Amino acid sequence: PFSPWPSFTQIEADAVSRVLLSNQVNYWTGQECRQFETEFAEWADSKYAIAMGNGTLALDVALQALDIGAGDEVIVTPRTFIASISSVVNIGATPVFSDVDEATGNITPESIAAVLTDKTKGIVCVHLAGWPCDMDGIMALADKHNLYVIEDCAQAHGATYKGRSVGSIGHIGAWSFCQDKIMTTGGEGGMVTTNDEQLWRKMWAYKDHGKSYAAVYETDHAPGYRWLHESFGTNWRMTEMQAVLGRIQLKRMPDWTAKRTANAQTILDACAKWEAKGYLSVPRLEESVQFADSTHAYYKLYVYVQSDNLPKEWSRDRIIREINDLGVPCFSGSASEVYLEKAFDNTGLRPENRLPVAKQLGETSLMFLVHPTLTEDEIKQTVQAIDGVFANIHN
Amino acid sequence: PFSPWPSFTQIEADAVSRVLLSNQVNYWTGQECRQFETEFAEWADSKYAIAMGNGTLALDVALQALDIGAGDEVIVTPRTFIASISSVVNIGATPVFSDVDEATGNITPESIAAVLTDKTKGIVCVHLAGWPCDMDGIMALADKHNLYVIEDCAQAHGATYKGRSVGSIGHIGAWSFCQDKIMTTGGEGGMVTTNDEQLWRKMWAYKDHGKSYAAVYETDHAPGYRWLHESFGTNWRMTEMQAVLGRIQLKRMPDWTAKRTANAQTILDACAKWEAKGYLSVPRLEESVQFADSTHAYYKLYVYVQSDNLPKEWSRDRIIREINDLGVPCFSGSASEVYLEKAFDNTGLRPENRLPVAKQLGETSLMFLVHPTLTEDEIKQTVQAIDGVFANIHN
Ligand SMILES: CC(=O)N[C@H]1[C@@H](OP(=O)(O)OP(=O)(O)OC[C@H]2O[C@@H](n3ccc(=O)[nH]c3=O)[C@H](O)[C@@H]2O)O[C@H](C)[C@@H](/N=C/c2c(COP(=O)(O)O)cnc(C)c2O)[C@@H]1O
Ligand SMILES: CC(=O)N[C@H]1[C@@H](OP(=O)(O)OP(=O)(O)OC[C@H]2O[C@@H](n3ccc(=O)[nH]c3=O)[C@H](O)[C@@H]2O)O[C@H](C)[C@@H](/N=C/c2c(COP(=O)(O)O)cnc(C)c2O)[C@@H]1O
Ligand SMILES: C[N+](C)(C)C
Ligand SMILES: C[N+](C)(C)C
Ligand code: NA
Ligand code: NA
């Protein structure tokens, strides 16, 4: 197999062992989560961060703080992991699907505007695979129509939009550190970021059974039982062992982004000849007029077949099989039409017509791995498999 | 300070280090959670178990599977941690408080029956401190009124009721492994247990984004993208590092229950002379005719002041102060009237009048530690602090 992702180091194993043997294992008995919060906020260009159990709970707590619920429409992408949509359903709101950009796979200002109604309250925009959304256009639309924006940053650690971290631009950023993500806190983890003090206080309470931050930290208490629960909430906390991994990985992020970026550019460079021959489309953020001064996180590397130009005996799926047969990982990538899941049967939530760009990218995507442990030889194998298979197509 | 709880061993540190370095860190990339589920189910006398992020999410997923929501009343206890009540509020149902037993601190068949209505659908009974509820009475009452029962077992690992593990008697058992609990999976953790296959399938899907167990494991899959999400759900999963701790601690539970029991017996025995003198009430499960062939988990050890028999210069609160001043941990214990929290302001959820037994136990409780790391000498010091302060009261 190729070099693993995730790939935990002895430093990380020693850190979790130390946290465990300290017995200071909980948000309320140690300081690892609290220091991870302040370090993550600084790293993500945000005033506030809160450590969460996972990226789904991060979306959930953001929707809770924004008072999104029954009768509110929230614009969502069809091209993502289901949590980016089901979080909206689970709070009782109505997800409404926008189509995506043919180059980036993200929802766009134009496709969001097309599905806005007088009931739209929110947008959950996903920075898919690490390519940032057009946040100037999305925030302009949100200002015009009085909408709240949640940036789903689960695939986008290290991405920037015109000089600032993703997750710092919308009202709230939601983050995952699940097992194969760019940051990976020991099996699960998440985070929210915000610049709004009131949204921070609301999310902080909600993930801690409705403990008021003001009651805990900003109030003088008599000895004995303390009355802290000033609203209803739940347990969406992270452990100390997950947090110490997060803190370690923040310090690695420049290295990790640089390695992902180098791996991606080697693969995109090799795909260019097959774009010239008409078999691939190879969108590159660094060559985009509209994503000047932005950076791609490179969670995963997408290119797209030009189906019309493949011989009849070839297809996207056959290319995946042939690259896999040469020992190189290759996938169809993200779900592109999550609304086709049976969860949407009889809900009235499925678009009445399939979203054409989302449908096309589901059919055309080829997805490659670029994670930081991949060796020069593994990236060479990747390039050689692409050249081998497309040379077979070309003859 | 007294011996710590929790108190993680080198064996546990080495196990979490091995899980991390394996890179098999997630429910979907390793087998520690799946083996913990089957071992926990067997240990807890249940056909099915599902690993959960925490005991709050265990309650939440049980209420989801039972289709409890808007317009449904659920009987709850006032004498617990808020999650036993706020889980009901958060799913949209109406918590209705029952008073508690003066000896055991648990809701009783009599006090539950007093607050039943035709809209009651469920009971969340807490085995407080490890003393099992009257499950014959509660299940009889649930049968006659067509109610579902959730056992909140967060404080009750090792408790049995007439030969059976707690958590195996109600429709669903909810469990916590939070940091100071009898089992403590490295900062957070939870579990549900059930004997009902359909409730198991529903909870298993809901904690995993609505992945159907049938779609994942009972369906032959074509190559490429698999359509699994047949209903809506969320991410309420446990990590592999938490699960390996759970598996280790299950094997220690005979020893841990025996040590907690021996510690409790020594303290209760010392309290007997002060009960004889009228200063304490010392309920003992092993002496209760109603709790024959049952066993106490001994999460914490409660006795109760007889307020009426204390001299004017004395109080429950002064006894706590004086025992702590001798170097012995002592607490007022569980919240006894959770409905007094400001979360309940303007909800209409407060009982018309304060619940009198619950109010009394909040005023009279003295709670001592009995966790398995406490040495013979620390238990001796506990007895001597009790004897010193009560000898002062007497003389
Ligand atoms: C355990 C784990 O690693 N889960 C990650 C994984 O989810 P998974 O269940 O495989 O979902 P899908 O990618 O829809 O795949 C469905 C099925 O098709 C198969 N498949 C998939 C792709 C493919 O190319 N080929 C294929 O055969 C899969 O093997 C699986 O059998 O892939 C997702 C993209 C990740 N995304 C999470 C996440 C959250 C939620 O964060 P959280 O996981 O709660 O921290 C929030 N927003 C965003 C934009 C997120 O990305 C999940 O964390
Ligand atoms: C981080 C941690 O260890 N939390 C545990 C702790 O909750 P805590 O926030 O302290 O809540 P309370 O006991 O109501 O105390 C409120 C305040 O008064 C203070 N206090 C409390 C008691 C006292 O004697 N003196 C005092 O000064 C506390 O320090 C705090 O400042 O004490 C609770 C009893 C535990 N209960 C858990 C659990 C779940 C929920 O499971 P989960 O915690 O989500 O796994 C579900 N059902 C059940 C029957 C559960 O037991 C919590 O796990
Ligand atoms: C530091 N960062 C803005 C690139 C995340
Ligand atoms: C049933 N028991 C093994 C938990 C005692
Ligand atoms: Na109903
Ligand atoms: Na009823």
Author numbering:
A (entry chain BBB), B (entry chain AAA): 5 to 399
Publication text:
Utilizing the published genome sequence of the organism, we hypothesized that the genes 0612, 0638, and 0637 encode for a 4,6-dehydratase, an aminotransferase, and an N-acetyltransferase, respectively, which would be required for the biosynthesis of one of the diacetamido-sugars, 2,4-diacetamido-2,4,6-trideoxy-d-glucose, starting from UDP-N-acetylglucosamine. In this report we present functional and structural data that demonstrate the proteins encoded by the 0638 and 0637 genes do indeed correspond to an aminotransferase (hereafter referred to as Pcryo_0638) and an N-acetyltransferase (Pcryo_0637). In summary, we have demonstrated that the genes in P. cryohalolentis, namely 0638 and 0637, encode for a PLP-dependent aminotransferase and an N-acetyltransferase, respectively. The data presented herein confirm the hypothesized functions of these enzymes and provide new insight into an unusual sugar biosynthetic pathway in Gram-negative bacteria.
